[PDB]
Amino acid sequence: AMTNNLYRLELERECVGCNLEGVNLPRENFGLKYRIPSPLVTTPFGMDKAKPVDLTRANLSNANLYQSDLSSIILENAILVETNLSETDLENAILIGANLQGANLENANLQGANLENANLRGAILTGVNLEETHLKGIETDKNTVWD
Ligand SMILES: [As]
């Protein structure tokens, strides 16, 4: 049940293999940079001992993650076809073997992110921060947009 998946995400910080196709989770915080204990109380302190959200083999196709924090997230072998990842924070994220076909990553931050063997066919990466981003083995095509 979706309710159970959301619980595992909020509490267990994971949802391996979950089916989250088309979910609407914009502006959420699934990263390791900050925490909100009043949405301005946001602070990085207290994150020294926190685990990264695990979404290995998860299906987030066509899901909306607009402006969500996904820093250090684990999306290994995840399915993200046509997913809205624009303006998301994917710093140090693990996207090994991820399927990002037709995904929208506009203005997303991918610093230190690992996208080895990831599929970027038709994906849009305009304005993306590729500083120290591992792009070894990625797949692209005439539809892949970089600018
Ligand atoms: As190609």
Topology (elements, then pairings):
Blueprint: H1 2-12
Keywords:
globular; 1 helix; monomer; little secondary structure; binds arsenic; 147 residues
- Could you give the count of β-strands? 0
Structural class: little secondary structure
- What's the number of helices? 1
The biggest beta sheet reads: none
* Beta-strand content bin: under 5%
Number of domains: 1
Identify the quaternary structure here.
Answer: monomer
Rg, Å, rounded: 14 Å
Shape label:
globular
N/C terminus separation: 40 Å
Q: How helical, in percent, are the residues? A: under 10%
SSE sequence, one letter per element: H
Ligands: arsenic
PDB class: unknown function
Keywords: Rfr protein, pentapeptide repeat protein, beta helix, unknown function
Assembly: monomeric
Entry title: Crystal Structure of a Pentapeptide Repeat Protein (Rfr23) from the cyanobacterium Cyanothece 51142
